[PDB]
Design a protein around this nucleic acid. Structure first.
Ligand SMILES: [K+]
Ligand SMILES: [Mg+2]
Length: 106
RNA sequence: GCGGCAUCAAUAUGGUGACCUCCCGGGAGCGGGGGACCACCAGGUUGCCUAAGGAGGGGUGAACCGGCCCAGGUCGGAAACGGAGCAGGUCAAAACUCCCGUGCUGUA
């Protein structure tokens, strides 16, 4: 439950524009074009998740130093005790697929 | 060796590299492992109604387009470390180009 134990979401995980080795985490059929951390958190937060922005972190695998291309997003799943904060997001993978599907909407 | 033209394919085994798609593990950088597909390679067969199909020797690789190894610096990290990768070094294997040889064909 300690922020230090929040999981990580780098936009690169979600970027349909990046190869596996550039860091893509979800299938292109679900991936998305150039999502930004902000977005990522902006969807998560408004789902009842606990999540904050590290606007300044920078994914390793990302030579470009442009902003649109940076920031990390921290999301708490389980409750210090051990329960997920929302039955619907067990896996980090679950989060990723969700974020990936709601952003197209904002 | 004067001028012309033209020079494999498909099979097995073991590399190299991309890419896609799934799990398991993790607070990052990540660890673990299953499939699919492409390109290139090694040297071993196989073959066609080849005119011949050696699987030859070089060079470029460079303002991102190659593979490796990567000083620095940079990003993740409390650190250990790890990633991405420039310079430089380097090469059985991105791609593009040079030398041959070799086979048929040739006519004044
Ligand atoms: K160091
Ligand atoms: Mg695999």
């Amino acid at each position: 439950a300690d922020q230090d134990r929040f999981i990580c979401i780098y936009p690169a995980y979600l970027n349909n524009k990046k190869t596996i080795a550039e860091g893509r985490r979800i299938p292109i059929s679900k991936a998305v074009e150039n999502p930004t951390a902000t977005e990522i958190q902006d969807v998560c937060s408004a789902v009842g998740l606990n999540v904050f922005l590290e606007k300044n972190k920078m994914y390793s695998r990302e030579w470009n130093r442009d902003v649109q291309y940076r920031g990390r997003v921290r999301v708490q799943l389980k409750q210090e005790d051990g329960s997920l904060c929302l039955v619907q997001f067990p896996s980090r993978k679950s989060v990723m697929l969700y974020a990936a599907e709601m952003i197209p909407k904002l």
